[PDB]
Design a protein around this ligand. Structure first.
Ligand SMILES: Nc1ncnc2c1ncn2[C@H]1C[C@H](O)[C@@H](COP(=O)(O)O)O1
Ligand SMILES: Nc1ncnc2c1ncn2[C@H]1C[C@H](O)[C@@H](COP(=O)(O)O)O1
Lengths: 517, 104, 103
């Protein structure tokens, strides 16, 4: 209830730190085109694609808003405060607003374009509260709010996939008409709002451990539990004998322990230094992949596993980490120097190394005649007594994902990162209401193909309330912090360049502060 | 029954922001080791990053309903999948829930 | 050192800009940032009301003090006034120190 000449909202970008919680707000400008001429179209993989790449689905005229990346809600400085001072954080509740809507009509005459306000035109917005539509958010697609507030972004088109057989469609394939959901219709002067409250979810670990999993022992004291030291006599004629000893400071690897490392599903190892890697093409052939319904699919990034062992910085697991492009990077065949490869190194203390075997097991029964042989375990599922760390969340990266609705889920934490949610923040859908062009003067029952070309722009605000977990540590010596380099440079990190382009030089994980196991 | 495959939850229209390793070798000219990255998208879905994995598997032998397609030998017991408990073998029947057959 | 009132909390800075209005987006989603904007500007009115406190002259000085006066002699243009072409001009700087006090 405003009208043409009254702004329907204000610009709120600030972040405020209450010290129990932080409330981060982001207001951005957006532009929504008219997708595929107001038409639902089915889409399917082109025949000739490999079996693994077939798909069947539907593309819709609707757009949608996704804030699911962290840097939407945090400036690099606000991110620094969080990761430096806190052991954990989780989202509590969010608030969403659309305001200052403008719908522009576009005419094209010869080689000139003309844009004019359409004051009576309408835009449609609905949030899906009941999760009745396919949920495309957690797939780490582009189209999220820009990192830098002054940027204007384009609203991505909404489309979804369903069951397929080859490129065809089985009878269970669902078709969803989004025009079948009650949606609010807005003009210039109308605004949209809703609130949301996150369900209870474990704090993310903002900490790295100060202890290895196998080192929890007291280094000074000797155990009371014996282990088998010798299966053979030490001196004289070699003879079979069983000899036992108490494990202690000198040999730690031999002691009894209460816990096991997290589950492993092994990765191939790549070398950053050129010419060290094998010469052959094996992203697909030599990879680790899961076979689902006759289709192979990479395991990416996969179960959380340490990227590299001690003193091996150069190597990284193939398809085992999140990779981010630097500004201006091609979407096809970018060089290693252009991408930013994240590192899971903090989880060494519990999780296995992604490129190394889980361990070793005995594959036979020995006797006097047959010597003991042992097999290598390259994949291990959960065993009683395992402990593990989840993959780290970055400044740019998924905040949440929707736990698929199924009978069973095991440790439902998104494998890209973030907060697994059964009821994730709803999908906000938006489209431009069709405006017909001049109808014929004699009735025809054919459907209109003739529409006025138009688009809409506006403002969007997202306010999320994040709960914090403070550092209680008694650690004497100084902890690692995330710091900016003091040395001079042509450009400042996390800042626009001479041409106005915002860029993020490096990925920033959240794990700096240290805790004990 | 589900209306979506587990690996198809993606938006088919939009391209991801996460790179994957497209090429371990140079495309043209003298073959040389090089690492090349790309953003996975509608064209190749199998390559994208995903948040979830399929349920646990304990593998079964496959039989054919059409006569004469199956092997000729007697293997209900010998070629089966079974768990060994206290020195006794026992079939895994029917076993962990797993789809009976793939598409077509 | 140029002059005036040193303030620890000076009158705040008032910032203003024109909200970006995009031009017609492409019909197929692209994650590149918009370089295409509708050229526009804005105009308006601005008012500033300041309340100044004064300190009166208490002097017992007998003889007349210097004052700032306009020259009586005739001239082509009047000082602190527009010219024939409409251009306002200030002929001289005017300090504030005329009245005299003792040390
Ligand atoms: N990311 C995520 N989302 C939801 N549930 C999860 C997640 N990670 C683990 N879990 C499950 C399994 C944990 O033992 C338990 C901890 O719940 P607590 O709240 O600590 O009592 O919740
Ligand atoms: N321009 C200006 N701004 C702020 N402070 C100043 C300034 N000039 C001098 N001072 C300081 C030093 C003076 O002795 C004192 C007079 O404060 P009084 O108010 O007279 O008691 O204030």
């Amino acid at each position: 209830a405003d009208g043409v000449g009254n702004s329907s909202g204000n610009w709120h970008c600030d972040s405020q730190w209450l010290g129990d919680r932080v409330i981060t707000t982001s207001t951005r400008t957006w532009a929504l085109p008219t997708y595929n001429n107001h038409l639902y179209k089915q889409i399917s993989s082109q025949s000739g694609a490999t079996n693994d790449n077939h798909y069947f689905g539907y593309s819709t005229p609707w757009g949608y808003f996704d804030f699911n990346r962290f840097h939407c809600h945090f400036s690099p400085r606000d991110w620094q405060r969080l990761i430096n001072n806190n052991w954990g954080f989780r989202p509590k509740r969010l608030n969403f607003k659309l305001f200052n809507i403008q719908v522009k009509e576009v005419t094209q005459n010869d080689g000139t374009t003309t844009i004019a306000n359409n004051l009576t035109s309408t835009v449609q917005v609905f949030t899906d509260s009941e999760y009745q539509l396919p949920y495309v958010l957690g797939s780490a697609h582009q189209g999220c709010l820009p990192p830098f507030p002054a940027d204007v972004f384009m609203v991505p088109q909404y489309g979804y996939l369903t069951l397929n057989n080859g490129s065809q469609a089985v009878g269970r394939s669902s078709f969803y008409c989004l025009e079948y959901f009650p949606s609010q219709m807005l003009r210039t002067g109308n605004n949209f709002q809703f609130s949301y409250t996150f369900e209870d979810v474990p704090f993310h670990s903002s900490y790295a451990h100060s202890q290895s999993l196998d080192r929890l022992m007291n280094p000074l004291i000797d155990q009371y539990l014996y282990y088998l030291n010798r299966t053979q006599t030490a001196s004289g004629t070699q003879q079979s004998r069983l000899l036992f000893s108490q494990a202690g400071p000198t040999s730690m690897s031999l002691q009894a322990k209460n816990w096991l490392p997290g589950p492993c599903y092994r990765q191939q190892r790549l070398s950053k230094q050129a010419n060290d890697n094998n010469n052959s093409n094996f992203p697909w052939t030599g990879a680790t992949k899961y076979h689902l319904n006759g289709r192979d699919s990479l395991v990416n990034p996969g179960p959380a596993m340490a990227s590299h062992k001690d003193d091996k910085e150069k190597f990284f697991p193939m398809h085992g980490t999140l990779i981010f492009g630097k500004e201006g990077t091609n979407a096809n065949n970018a060089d290693l120097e252009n991408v930013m490869i994240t590192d899971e190194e903090e989880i060494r203390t519990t999780n296995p190394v992604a490129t190394e075997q889980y361990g070793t097991v005995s594959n036979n029964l020995q006797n006097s005649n047959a010597g003991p042989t042992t097999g290598t375990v390259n994949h291990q599922g959960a065993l009683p007594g395992m402990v593990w760390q989840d993959r780290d969340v970055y400044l740019q990266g998924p905040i949440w994902a929707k736990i698929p609705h199924t009978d069973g889920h095991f440790h439902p934490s998104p494998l890209m990162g973030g907060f697994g949610l059964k009821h994730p923040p709803p999908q906000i859908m938006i489209k431009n209401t069709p405006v017909p062009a001049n109808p014929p003067t004699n009735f025809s029952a054919a459907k209109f193909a003739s529409f006025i070309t138009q688009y809409s722009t506006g403002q969007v605000s997202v306010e999320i309330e994040w709960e914090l977990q403070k550092e209680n540590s008694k650690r004497w010596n100084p902890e690692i912090q995330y710091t900016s380099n003091y040395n001079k440079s042509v450009n400042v990190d996390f800042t626009v360049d001479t041409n106005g382009v915002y860029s993020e030089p490096r990925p920033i994980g959240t794990r700096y502060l240290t805790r004990n196991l």
